[PDB]
Motif scaffolding. Sequence first.
Motif, PDB file in Angstrom:
ATOM      1  N   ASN A 630     -35.735 -51.166   8.050  1.00 40.04           N
ATOM      2  CA  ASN A 630     -36.784 -51.112   7.004  1.00 40.04           C
ATOM      3  C   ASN A 630     -38.067 -51.430   7.656  1.00 40.04           C
ATOM      4  O   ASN A 630     -39.013 -50.720   7.527  1.00 40.04           O
ATOM      5  N   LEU A 631     -37.829 -52.356   8.518  1.00 38.35           N
ATOM      6  CA  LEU A 631     -39.275 -52.838   9.436  1.00 38.35           C
ATOM      7  C   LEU A 631     -39.667 -51.700  10.347  1.00 38.35           C
ATOM      8  O   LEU A 631     -40.677 -51.786  10.734  1.00 38.35           O
ATOM      9  N   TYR A 632     -38.672 -51.056  10.720  1.00 41.56           N
ATOM     10  CA  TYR A 632     -39.103 -50.033  11.656  1.00 41.56           C
ATOM     11  C   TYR A 632     -39.536 -48.744  10.808  1.00 41.56           C
ATOM     12  O   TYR A 632     -40.789 -48.411  10.925  1.00 41.56           O
ATOM     13  N   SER A 633     -38.869 -48.093  10.009  1.00 41.44           N
ATOM     14  CA  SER A 633     -39.203 -47.039   9.169  1.00 41.44           C
ATOM     15  C   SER A 633     -40.467 -47.167   8.760  1.00 41.44           C
ATOM     16  O   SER A 633     -41.598 -46.274   9.048  1.00 41.44           O
ATOM     17  N   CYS A 634     -40.710 -48.108   7.846  1.00 42.48           N
ATOM     18  CA  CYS A 634     -41.777 -48.510   7.336  1.00 42.48           C
ATOM     19  C   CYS A 634     -42.896 -49.533   7.828  1.00 42.48           C
ATOM     20  O   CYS A 634     -43.346 -50.469   7.403  1.00 42.48           O
ATOM     21  N   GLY A 635     -42.993 -49.465   9.501  1.00 46.28           N
ATOM     22  CA  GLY A 635     -43.663 -50.517  10.145  1.00 46.28           C
ATOM     23  C   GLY A 635     -44.592 -49.964  11.131  1.00 46.28           C
ATOM     24  O   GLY A 635     -44.161 -48.864  11.770  1.00 46.28           O
ATOM     25  N   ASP A 636     -45.417 -50.758  11.304  1.00 44.66           N
ATOM     26  CA  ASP A 636     -46.428 -50.463  12.521  1.00 44.66           C
ATOM     27  C   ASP A 636     -45.896 -51.487  13.676  1.00 44.66           C
ATOM     28  O   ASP A 636     -46.333 -52.753  13.602  1.00 44.66           O
ATOM     29  N   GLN A 637     -44.704 -51.322  14.192  1.00 43.53           N
ATOM     30  CA  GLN A 637     -44.100 -52.040  15.377  1.00 43.53           C
ATOM     31  C   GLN A 637     -44.996 -52.501  16.463  1.00 43.53           C
ATOM     32  O   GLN A 637     -44.875 -53.587  16.999  1.00 43.53           O
ATOM     33  N   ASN A 638     -46.473 -52.281  16.472  1.00 45.22           N
ATOM     34  CA  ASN A 638     -47.407 -52.740  16.721  1.00 45.22           C
ATOM     35  C   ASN A 638     -48.147 -53.479  16.167  1.00 45.22           C
ATOM     36  O   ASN A 638     -48.460 -54.717  16.359  1.00 45.22           O
ATOM     37  N   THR A 639     -48.304 -53.075  14.952  1.00 42.74           N
ATOM     38  CA  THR A 639     -49.418 -53.773  14.066  1.00 42.74           C
ATOM     39  C   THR A 639     -48.608 -55.342  13.401  1.00 42.74           C
ATOM     40  O   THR A 639     -49.146 -56.133  13.216  1.00 42.74           O
ATOM     41  N   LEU A 640     -47.185 -55.155  13.407  1.00 45.51           N
ATOM     42  CA  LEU A 640     -46.435 -56.290  12.797  1.00 45.51           C
ATOM     43  C   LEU A 640     -46.581 -57.447  13.963  1.00 45.51           C
ATOM     44  O   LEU A 640     -46.374 -58.641  13.432  1.00 45.51           O
ATOM     45  N   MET A 641     -46.147 -57.095  15.036  1.00 52.50           N
ATOM     46  CA  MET A 641     -46.199 -58.200  16.343  1.00 52.50           C
ATOM     47  C   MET A 641     -47.602 -58.420  16.775  1.00 52.50           C
ATOM     48  O   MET A 641     -48.012 -58.263  17.991  1.00 52.50           O
ATOM     49  N   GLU A 642     -48.570 -58.585  16.026  1.00 53.10           N
ATOM     50  CA  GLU A 642     -50.048 -58.843  16.470  1.00 53.10           C
ATOM     51  C   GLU A 642     -50.297 -60.070  16.508  1.00 53.10           C
ATOM     52  O   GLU A 642     -49.360 -61.094  16.044  1.00 53.10           O
ATOM     53  N   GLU A 643     -51.325 -60.432  17.340  1.00 50.85           N
ATOM     54  CA  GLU A 643     -51.538 -61.773  17.622  1.00 50.85           C
ATOM     55  C   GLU A 643     -52.546 -62.552  16.519  1.00 50.85           C
ATOM     56  O   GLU A 643     -53.475 -62.204  16.173  1.00 50.85           O
ATOM     57  N   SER A 644     -51.775 -63.614  15.846  1.00 46.24           N
ATOM     58  CA  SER A 644     -52.826 -64.531  15.261  1.00 46.24           C
ATOM     59  C   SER A 644     -54.028 -65.127  15.883  1.00 46.24           C
ATOM     60  O   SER A 644     -53.557 -65.207  17.485  1.00 46.24           O
ATOM     61  N   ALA A 645     -55.001 -64.610  15.525  1.00 42.05           N
ATOM     62  CA  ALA A 645     -56.306 -65.035  16.492  1.00 42.05           C
ATOM     63  C   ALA A 645     -56.192 -66.489  17.160  1.00 42.05           C
ATOM     64  O   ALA A 645     -56.526 -66.507  18.336  1.00 42.05           O
ATOM     65  N   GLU A 646     -55.355 -67.274  16.620  1.00 38.21           N
ATOM     66  CA  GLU A 646     -55.142 -68.557  17.345  1.00 38.21           C
ATOM     67  C   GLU A 646     -54.614 -68.522  18.710  1.00 38.21           C
ATOM     68  O   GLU A 646     -55.290 -68.632  19.660  1.00 38.21           O
ATOM     69  N   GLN A 647     -53.420 -67.764  18.907  1.00 41.59           N
ATOM     70  CA  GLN A 647     -52.870 -67.515  20.148  1.00 41.59           C
ATOM     71  C   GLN A 647     -53.763 -66.785  20.998  1.00 41.59           C
ATOM     72  O   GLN A 647     -53.768 -66.718  22.287  1.00 41.59           O
ATOM     73  N   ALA A 648     -54.163 -65.517  20.274  1.00 43.41           N
ATOM     74  CA  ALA A 648     -54.980 -64.596  21.061  1.00 43.41           C
ATOM     75  C   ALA A 648     -55.864 -65.384  21.977  1.00 43.41           C
ATOM     76  O   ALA A 648     -56.121 -65.129  23.168  1.00 43.41           O
ATOM     77  N   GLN A 649     -56.840 -66.113  21.387  1.00 41.04           N
ATOM     78  CA  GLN A 649     -57.969 -67.040  21.923  1.00 41.04           C
ATOM     79  C   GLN A 649     -57.188 -68.197  22.760  1.00 41.04           C
ATOM     80  O   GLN A 649     -57.751 -67.975  23.787  1.00 41.04           O
ATOM     81  N   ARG A 650     -56.354 -68.948  22.333  1.00 36.92           N
ATOM     82  CA  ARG A 650     -55.676 -69.721  22.944  1.00 36.92           C
ATOM     83  C   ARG A 650     -55.492 -69.114  24.305  1.00 36.92           C
ATOM     84  O   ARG A 650     -55.451 -69.808  25.638  1.00 36.92           O
TER      85      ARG A 650
END
Length: 669
Positions: A630-650
């Motif tokens: 379900n997470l695949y078919s109906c998923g942006d496997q890119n968008t789902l595993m996105e960076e919380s701004a927190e860690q992106a910045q850190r």
Amino acid sequence: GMEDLIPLVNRLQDAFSAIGQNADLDLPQIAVVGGQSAGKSSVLENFVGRDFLPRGSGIVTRRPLVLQLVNSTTEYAEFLHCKGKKFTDFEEVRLEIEAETDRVTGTNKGISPVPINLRVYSPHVLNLTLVDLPGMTKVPVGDQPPDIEFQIRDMLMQFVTKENCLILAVSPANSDLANSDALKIAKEVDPQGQRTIGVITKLDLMDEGTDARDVLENKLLPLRRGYIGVVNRSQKDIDGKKDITAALAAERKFFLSHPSYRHLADRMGTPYLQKVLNQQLTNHIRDTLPGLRNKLQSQLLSIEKEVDEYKNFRPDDPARKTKALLQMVQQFAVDFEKRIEGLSGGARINRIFHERFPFELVKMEFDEKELRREISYAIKNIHFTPDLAFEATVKKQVQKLKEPSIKCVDMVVSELTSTIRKCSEKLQQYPRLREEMERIVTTHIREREGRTKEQVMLLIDIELAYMNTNHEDFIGFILVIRKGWLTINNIGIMSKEYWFVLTAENLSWYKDDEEKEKKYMLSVDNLKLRDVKHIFALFNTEQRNVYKDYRQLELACETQEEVDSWKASFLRAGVYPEPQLERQVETIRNLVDSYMAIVNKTVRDLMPKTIMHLMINNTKEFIFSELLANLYSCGDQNTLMEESAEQAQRRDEMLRMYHALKEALSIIG
């Protein structure tokens, strides 16, 4: 390579200042620290020979200024953010500091620790490099200072707690030097005065009849690296800014012509200072560099650990990426299997199933009195009666197990939700994944709740549709006796003898042995006899009353014999010395109880298995075998595993720090 130690180090000041860092790296550098009443601006400006610092109310310096004074024969300056454009007019420099500070400060006048590097080449300086920090204010007769005072203090503290930091403490001569902000600071952080250089300004502003010589001859608060005196007479103008030549001439003059400093003129002044700061800086660097290169390695082999944990946290580099989702999902799934099958979810569920639910059921039970009431009522309802009193009352009781059975489904949907929420903490690493996952599984659970409740309801209905009486744990399916005088010692008492006639049905009594007046008639049904002249008493077993409101009739006669023969007569009437419903209702009650035991045992067995099957197991399989899909078919496997701004910045910080440390270490090699 002494000559290159100041340019070396301030090439490290660039490398780290380029990422917004400086203090926390323990660079061998000098920190200008003073009250505003000192005019550290005038000292710096005197070094350079040209006015170039921001002019206004409050602090002159609102961000640390890594001023890199470099000697040459050409006069000009360049920044770090505007590298390429060489500055030639200094008022532009001033206005540019103002500008670049207003940019980051986000206020007309608010401070920040993020340094500005300003390199100035001129023939008016030595190779010297200072960090200008904000000033302070001397707190007036008591009185709490302003927040900003505390902020400034905390910053100067951020800088001068580093053991590699030389504190250039700038106090004014024309103020009680005991109470002198700069020196108080320097003292608190370097209590043996081994990395503090005092500079004393405005020496030409002291009162007539008072000199600051006991301080400069290094005798009051002596420092290792001594004090230097300076006065600020910007005497001429090459049009508007400093004629540093005349001004330094003036200074020299003041120190030669003042009798208290005369004998020290050679160890005072801006020039001498430049020379001293130059020496001490170069030596400080030579002495501390070996440690620094090591600090910088312990720091770079800490950033490699985290850089290695991150660069591997996310595999968006090979065709992997998705492998990451897969493993996150497997983590969730395992968390969940372990939790719900072992104080925690599975245990709480065990207690729901096998400790509570049983009780929820018991409190839905008919108590003796209300069960007999129910049965009798069910007989009054049906003018065969046994069978249907049984059916009636069972179906009654059984209808009431729907609440405790629906209820149980809830207590479990509850612990199940609680567990999905715990498991999904291990996904904070991934905000969108945690979000969507917790969402979807919470959904699946709410659908299963529907289907599960339906089924539980249905089971009780099934139980209602047929009384299985074949179940093997269903363990069920007027001539007269005597006449005589006799006395009542209880009647009135507020006690005459009467004439008694005992037939086989009634004991009735009269006024006289003539029998004209019948005073009373009592039915021998339900009568029993006790002992208490010789005296005995009649009472009624079914209830409490025999003769009007008299719980028992008191009969007395003279002889023991008289009594005995009377008793014998009452015995012949069925009155010994100590109804269809009553029995039937009991019978039915036992039947009902038994069949109920069977039902309870069943329901207690079956609701748990129903919930396991339709909800728990169902949810489990969903997580293990459908969820990822379900997470695949109906998923942006890119968008789902996105960076919380927190860690992106850190981790942008992490990386930046990585490169800056690389540059530093190679610069030091």
